[PDB]
């Protein structure tokens, strides 16, 4: 009468034949998300095997497949990035309702296809009244996580989000896109914050606007953080970290959220500590420090050690225009402390490379007695991509974690530091940044 393990076996026989067309591998994939078949991984793999083997593709069967890959939580980069072949060829034949699901699924997997996004943005900005505001939050999500810094769509999206009313999930997809691009223009972010007044249908849109408001560093909206006080059981433990990290970056004092959000992660780390990556474990050490909501002693000691690991991986794999900047800021902080010759400048910058107490390496770590001042340089990758060009929310994360370790972090951005004409003027901007943070230096 109603049998789920019987219909999985007959979908398993459907995608196991030899001449499976596109329309049934679309419909086997759609049927696997509606039945929530995360536990059977090979049956999902048999579908994605025959999905890349299909040569015919129309506009309806492609978007049913890309919807099912996207909401199914299924990632395989080889199959999904090879689906941009049918997506580019069928792009005039696609409706604006369906063209959003194509760019959201290919963008959300990180498919590096520039002529797809250069063509799928030129459709949206040319006929923008044809697109519902929920259908423009997906193309904005698609070009953002596909690696395109398209501001021609991001400016034209702000005209729609300030005129037409959007949903709770629509704005949070549009905020999560803007946090990836790093734009933070207050004429659009507050137009997306007037949508969190109806209460959220999901927990994921409350958690994603948390990460997006924190990494753009605006503040909490007080309905987004109150949505996390009761629905913090609908989130994965990697999804609950980026919620609390984005709350601690946005200056949240609501400890009833941090009590609930850490109730997801701290059992999961004690379940399997290897489950979350170190890029996500370091975001939990930020969240348990700034709002101060304490973790278990087995977890918080382990997560603090995972901030030392994730900071050196950002230092070992440094962008080498940051290394050309950090070695320039370390030189200009040697001129400010007094060194007019080249052998006495360079003899000082080798002494500033003290080790942080969690095992990390700080590039400019200066001590006068017991008062420690860290100088942190943030080149362009951590700056907002607009014309004010203020640093993103993650530099406050790196400040307040070292500040709880005993340092007075003097942050110097490279849109300001490298605008100076000479080296002693670079030294006075560094010394003005140290006196603003630590007045005894």
């Amino acid at each position: 009468e109603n049998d789920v393990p019987a219909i999985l076996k007959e979908i398993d026989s459907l995608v196991s034949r030899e001449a499976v067309s596109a329309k049934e591998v679309s419909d086997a994939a759609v049927a696997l998300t509606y039945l929530q078949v995360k536990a059977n991984r090979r049956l999902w793999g048999k579908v994605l095997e025959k999905a890349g083997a299909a040569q015919d593709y129309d506009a309806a069967s492609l978007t049913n497949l890309l919807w099912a890959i996207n909401t199914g939580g299924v990632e395989h980069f080889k199959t999904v990035a090879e689906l941009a072949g049918p997506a580019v060829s069928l792009l005039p034949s696609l409706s604006p309702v369906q063209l959003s699901i194509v760019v959201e699924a290919l963008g959300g997997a990180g498919v590096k296809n520039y002529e797809l996004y250069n063509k799928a943005s030129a459709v949206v900005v040319s006929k923008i009244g044809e697109f519902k505001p929920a259908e423009i939050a997906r193309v904005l999500y698609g070009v953002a996580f596909g690696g395109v810094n398209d501001v021609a769509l991001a400016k034209a999206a702000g005209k729609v989000f300030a005129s037409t009313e959007v949903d709770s999930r629509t704005a949070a997809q549009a905020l999560y896109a803007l946090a990836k691009l790093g734009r933070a223009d207050k004429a659009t972010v507050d137009a997306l914050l007037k949508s969190f007044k109806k209460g959220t249908e999901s927990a994921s849109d409350a958690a994603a606007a948390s990460f997006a408001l924190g990494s753009l560093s605006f503040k909490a909206e007080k309905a987004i953080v109150d949505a996390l006080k009761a629905s913090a059981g609908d989130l994965a433990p990697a999804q609950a970290v980026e919620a609390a990290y984005g709350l601690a970056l946005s200056g949240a004092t609501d400890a009833e959220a941090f009590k609930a959000l850490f109730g997801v992660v701290a059992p999961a780390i004690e379940k399997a500590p290897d489950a979350l990556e170190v890029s996500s474990l370091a975001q939990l050490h930020v969240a348990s420090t700034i709002s101060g909501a304490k973790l278990p002693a087995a977890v918080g000691s382990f997560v603090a050690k995972a901030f030392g690991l994730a900071a050196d991986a950002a230092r070992l794999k440094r962008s080498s225009a940051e290394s050309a900047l950090v070695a320039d800021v370390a030189a200009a902080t040697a001129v400010a402390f007094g060194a007019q010759y080249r052998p006495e400048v360079a003899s000082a910058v080798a002494s500033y490379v003290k080790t942080a107490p969690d095992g990390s390496v700080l590039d400019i770590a200066i001590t006068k007695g017991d008062a420690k001042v860290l100088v942190q340089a943030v080149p362009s990758s951590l700056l907002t991509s607009t014309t004010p060009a203020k640093p993103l929310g993650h530099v406050a994360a790196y400040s307040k974690v070292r500040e709880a370790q005993g340092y007075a972090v003097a942050v110097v951005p490279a849109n300001e530091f490298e605008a100076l004409p000479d080296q002693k003027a670079k030294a006075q901007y560094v010394l003005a940044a140290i006196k603003k943070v630590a007045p005894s230096f």
Partner: protein, 290 residues
């Protein structure tokens, strides 16, 4: 085990045997182990040599996990193959190929004051058909000024060459007016966005034209390997490949105690497991525990 610097490269990496030793290292720190200090020494010659041989331990399993798009129709299997090599280089610590090869030019020609010298130190990294097309344009400008063209740029004799070498670049097919305006930028972000979208149109057409030439050479290598192999009798083939298999096992079994040869022969056992798990149930494939 890992020596605390290999494990920092394998955090962002996604290959299996590097994600197995990170998850073994992350399980140790949960069981009360102290993370060691990251070494605050090893000067810039040693440090860029450690980066060379640690990126090579992230690249080398990642290349073997990327399926070549051999004999496929369209550009999207070639763009999948280039995008998989980009994300592999980003995981191995490289920057964009545009940023990483322009760093290679500025490193090779830090001291070259004449433009004949930058054509002779960056000869390994630029095309020999394009190194020659800029050496002919060099001698056409070397004849006019009757002097070595210096590598300064604000000299008007430089842009006697630089406006002529720009005509070569559009003749080769690449828009140099678009490439130069991307790395310099503009004031407003609206007119910087339309020169960005015309640069990445070239850039995506540059690596896909470079990945496909790397694919069309593997297609042509395997086709000339096969047609040399289809001309033999079978008894020649079976004893030529059993000899090369035996010469390569005795290469791995004389060296013992090495980590590479112990892991080589552990993979010989893992191929034999794959052939044994298919013979149990060939309709389902190898037995994967889940």
């Amino acid at each position: 085990a890992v020596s605390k610097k290999e494990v920092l490269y394998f955090l962002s990496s996604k290959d299996a045997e590097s994600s197995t030793a990170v998850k073994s290292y992350l399980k140790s720190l949960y069981a009360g182990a102290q993370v060691e200090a990251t070494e605050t020494d090893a000067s810039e010659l040693i440090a860029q040599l450690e980066k060379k041989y640690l990126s090579a331990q992230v690249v080398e399993p990642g290349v073997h996990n990327i399926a070549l798009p051999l004999g496929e129709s369209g550009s999207a299997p070639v763009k999948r193959y280039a995008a998989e090599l980009f994300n592999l280089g980003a995981q191995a610590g490289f920057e964009c190929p545009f940023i990483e090869v322009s760093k290679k030019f500025g490193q090779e020609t830090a001291t070259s004051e004449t433009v004949k010298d930058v054509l002779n130190k960056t000869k390994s990294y630029v095309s020999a058909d394009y190194n020659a097309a800029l050496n002919e344009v060099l001698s056409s400008v070397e004849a006019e000024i009757n002097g070595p063209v210096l590598f300064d740029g604000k000299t008007e004799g430089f842009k006697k060459f630089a406006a002529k070498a720009k005509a070569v670049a559009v003749s080769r097919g690449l828009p140099a007016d678009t490439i130069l305006a991307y790395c310099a930028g503009s004031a407003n972000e609206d007119a910087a966005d339309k020169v960005s979208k015309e640069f990445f149109t070239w850039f995506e057409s540059a690596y896909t034209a470079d990945a496909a030439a790397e694919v069309k050479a593997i297609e042509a290598e395997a086709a000339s390997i096969l047609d040399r192999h289809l001309a033999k009798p079978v008894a020649q083939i079976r004893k030529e490949q059993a000899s090369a298999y035996a010469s390569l096992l005795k290469r791995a079994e004389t060296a013992k105690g090495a980590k590479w040869a112990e892991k080589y022969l552990e993979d010989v056992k893992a191929v034999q497991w794959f052939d044994a798990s298919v013979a149990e149930a060939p309709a389902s494939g190898p037995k994967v525990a889940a």
